[PDB]
Design a protein around this ligand. Sequence first.
Ligand SMILES: [Zn+2]
Lengths: 162, 222
Amino acid sequence: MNKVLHQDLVQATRRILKLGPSELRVTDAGLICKNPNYSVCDAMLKTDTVYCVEYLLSYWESRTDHVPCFIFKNTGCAVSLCCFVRAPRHVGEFNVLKVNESLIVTLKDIEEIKPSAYGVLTKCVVRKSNSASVFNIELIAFGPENEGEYENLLRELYAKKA
Amino acid sequence: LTLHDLHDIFREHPELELKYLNMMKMAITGKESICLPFNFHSHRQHTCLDISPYGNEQVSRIACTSCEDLPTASDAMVAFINQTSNIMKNRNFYYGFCKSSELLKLSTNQPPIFQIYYLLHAANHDIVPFMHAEDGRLHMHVIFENPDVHIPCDCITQMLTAAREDYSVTLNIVRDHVVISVLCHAVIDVTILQRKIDEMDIPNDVSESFERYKELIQELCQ
Ligand SMILES: [Zn+2]
């Protein structure tokens, strides 16, 4: 863990989750070098909004070379996603999350939910539940609109890698 | 290729990232089966219900391939107020009272009954409502004539809205029919209604329904 890595992951978390500057809490870079059990940053998740959680997880891993671990928290009247580089109750396709409860998502967990490995990107949505201050967390896997477009783009991407 | 690789390429190729994430927009999960009877309060939001011989299915609207791209709870209110003018169009609703004055009165102090009908009727014309009371509180059972029943997510959240936490709303299959039961747990121009409905005839085609549905109806009264 270092400063630029810290900047990198914070910026990417804003970009990938499409957050306002208001919606992300950042632990001090100096603090998190020394304490990996604290989170790099924590994102406010709006309800009814699709968030690219697999994409974000894989982004982190590609830069840390460490298996990341994000935690959904029901903090009482809000869900936050707390982003950890390492880890210290895991996600399924649909999840009930009550006040004080936590739900861990890793790449391994996404993997077990999703139906096929390739051409599949998993996202998530938070919904406000019928009664109480309880939220539901859906994980939803997405494919290409058109499989031709997608085969093409891969070939292009194969050609880029050097 | 892995997502790992994609990120390394996208850092240099932001044009390609855009195109990529724009194509990943077709839900391939969302559909799951469910158990009858199905309590609508205990359900997932923005999910349709698909009931057919083949399966009983909740499906996220993002994942629904039946509903294309309506009527509000508040809209059904305004039909409620003007039912006086739409009596022959809602003759199917009123057939449901079986010529009772007393039940018909009770539905004047219970808008969610009319509304929930109105909301389901917008979604499906092929329904046969029936009404009865326990302790002055009016109940309704909506019988679907067909085994293929799709209930859009929008109709559902709005039924739930119209029902407050007064009524239970429930879907079940009873004697070979899909039936939505609306069970009241608690609770303006009556006079012209009572008259116009007392004056309106019930035709032999409809009376055959109620005859064929007699034991179904007997079984729904509890
Ligand atoms: Zn639908």
